[PDB]
Every structure is written in C-alpha cells, then in structure tokens.
C-alpha cells in the first residue's frame, strides 16, 4: 500500500482479504455487503475501512476435492450415506466461510456443480437420470419423512405440479392444493441464510461478554451466585459461548 | 507424534526470534510482568 | 507469546478479523502523504 495503490491484499486461514480505508475511496457510494468489513478505529470509534472478503481458489479446490473424495468413498453408493457426507461437507464449508463464501462466484458455482454430482450419483444408483423422475422432494425432504435430508447451498425451484395431494373422505375424493392461484414457486432454502455472519457474532460476542462482566461484578458485589436465570437473552451468544 | 505440535511451536518460536530479532520480539511480546495483547503495544512510542 | 498461533482464544475467522482490526488501528497507517508505505508479506517456512 503506497501513495498510488490504495488496496491492501493478504490471505489468511482460508480468507482472501482486501482492506480499503474510507479515506482514499473514489467510490462515493459504498456497496457494503455482509462480506465487507467496517474496520473501526478505537481512538475515535469510527469506521475507517472495509475489508472485502473472498474464499481463496485453493480452498474452493479443497472443497471440490472433498466432494470428489466423498464420491470415491467406500459407502458412496448408499443414498443416505452419500447424503450425510454431503451434508457434513456443506455444513463445514458454510459454517467456516460464511459471508466470504456467499460473495465468491466460483465457490457458488462449485457448490452447484458438486450438489449436482451428488444427486447424479443418487440417480445413477437407480439407473436413471430423468429429471421428472427425481423431484426436489426426493432429495431435500428431511430423513424423518423418509427423504434423504440433503441441505442445499444452491437455488432450486419447487414447481406447482409437485404441490398437490388428494384425500379420500366419506363423501368422496377431494384434491387439496397449497398456493391457490399463485404463479410463483417456492424455492429450496439456502443453508447460508441460516448461519449468522462472522462480523455479527464478533460484535455480539463483545457486547454479550461486556454485559456478562458487568453482571458478574455486580453479582459478586451483592454476594450472590450467578445462575441460568439472569443469563437467558445471552444464552447461545458469544465467542466462546456463554 | 502426540507432542509434535508443542515441539514445533517452540522451535518456530525460536525461528520467530531469528526473524524478528530479540529486541523487536521483546517489544511485540511485551514485558513478562504485563504481556501485550495480540497485535497491540503499550504506547504509540514503542510501536513506531 | 501473543504472535504464536493457533491460539486457544479464537477461531481462525476471528484471527483474520483481529488482523484486519490491528492493521486498521496502527498509528497513521493509512496516511501516505509523506512517502510512507505499508508492506505485508505472507510466506511459509520451507522444509522446516
């Protein structure tokens, strides 16, 4: 970083980071997403920078190789086993790389192709590749209802054709349908939406542990012992957790 | 080996002394009485 | 000392975050009017 190169580049522990300060910015409008990091100066408590995060190409290839190893494994012909291995790999990838992962186009393409390869393995196990033969309910139904219980990092449509069910009551057959006269389709949920981003948990961990320090000092002042009751809104909170 | 992490972190600490130099390593690590936090110094004097 | 990682106090994303916050909290780190430059070198100890 110099007089005429305003970006600071590094890579660390999976994350490719570009630090840009909020002084040498030609962009008057800030496209700040969850991946972008507001770096706060403590002596002013002022957001002076923005660390853009991405996942390195070596780690995208690491995830791809993990899926290839899953697909070459010994138990990779049983559909529940292959689905569980895919679920473990996808959970590990997203819960590690979070907002940096959602901002990497190559990583999302790799996730789509690897999920397609897992489903293709399931289909080849049945000697078919017909897309109408395997609706999203075959893969993404939870294991409780007999489905595979796969989690998706892709964006998959659920058509209105797979939204009907009939029931035989004492007066005859009634065909019920969810979504009466609605031209849109529900999509399979994205796993990345169900994980809180890293910067959010850093800020909340700071807030929660300072409140815990205050609570501990005031509780030892009145000589009472800390319990579960006064720590309820900060239960699954903090790094490390309360 | 089970203790290889410990032995290599100590050996790499010695190599960190080689890379930094003992005086700058002492300034970064802080005094033994009051060790510094990660990526922080006592004052803007010693940092610069 | 504090520079020796993996430390038990943080996950590696928190290590990257503290690297970013420690870069941002250095004295006049972004001031480059007087010819100052910031160098960051990331390397590996070969065959260590």
């Amino acid at each position: 970083y110099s007089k005429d190169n305003p970006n600071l580049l590094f890579s660390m522990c999976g994350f490719e980071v570009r630090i840009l300060p909020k002084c040498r910015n030609q962009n008057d409008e800030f496209p700040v997403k969850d991946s972008v990091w507001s770096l706060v100066d403590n002596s002013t408590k002022e957001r002076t920078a923005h660390a853009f995060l991405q996942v390195t190409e070596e780690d995208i290839q690491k995830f791809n190789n993990r899926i290839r190893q899953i697909l070459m494994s010994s138990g990779s012909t049983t559909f529940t086993k292959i689905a569980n291995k895919w679920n473990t790999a996808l959970i590990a990838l997203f819960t590690y790389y979070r907002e940096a992962a959602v901002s990497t186009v190559n990583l999302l393409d790799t996730i789509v192709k690897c999920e397609t390869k897992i489903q293709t393995r399931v289909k080849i196990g049945l000697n078919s590749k017909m897309p109408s033969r395997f609706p999203p309910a075959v893969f993404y139904t939870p294991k409780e209802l007999g489905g595979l219980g796969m989690l998706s990092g892709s964006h998959i449509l659920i058509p209105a054709s797979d939204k009907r069910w009939c029931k035989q009551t004492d007066v005859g057959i009634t065909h019920f349908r969810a979504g009466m006269s609605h031209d849109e389709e529900t999509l399979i949920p994205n796993i990345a939406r169900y994980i809180i981003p890293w910067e959010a948990e850093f800020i909340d961990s700071q807030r929660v542990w300072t409140e815990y320090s205050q609570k501990r000092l005031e509780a030892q002042q009145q000589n009472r012992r800390l319990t579960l009751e006064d720590l309820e809104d900060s239960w699954d909170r903090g790094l490390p957790r309360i | 080996l089970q203790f290889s992490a410990f032995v290599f972190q100590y050996y790499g600490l010695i190599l960190d002394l080689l890379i930094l130099g003992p005086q700058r390593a002492a300034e970064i690590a802080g005094p033994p009485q009051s060790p510094n936090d990660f990526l922080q110094f006592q004052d803007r004097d010693t940092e610069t | 000392p504090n520079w020796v990682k993996p430390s038990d106090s943080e996950v590696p994303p928190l290590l990257v975050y503290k690297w970013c916050q420690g870069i941002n909290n250095l004295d006049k780190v972004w001031d480059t009017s007087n010819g100052e430059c910031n160098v960051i070198i990331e390397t590996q100890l070969s065959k260590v």
Binding site: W209, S213, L239 | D37, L39, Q40 | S9, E10, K18, Q21
Partner: peptide, 25 residues
C-alpha cells in the same frame, strides 16, 4: 470441594480472557 471450585474458576477467567482479547488492553 475448594480445589474444584478454584480450578472451575480458573476455567472461568480462561473463558473471559479468551473473550476479552484486545478489549482488555
């Protein structure tokens, strides 16, 4: 047990110092 209380307390300041990295300084 007093010793057990001491070393569980030691876990407690270990977790607080893990959470208070940089904020303590």
């Amino acid at each position: 047990d007093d010793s057990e209380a001491e070393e569980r307390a030691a876990y407690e300041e270990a977790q607080v110092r893990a959470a208070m990295d940089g904020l303590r300084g």
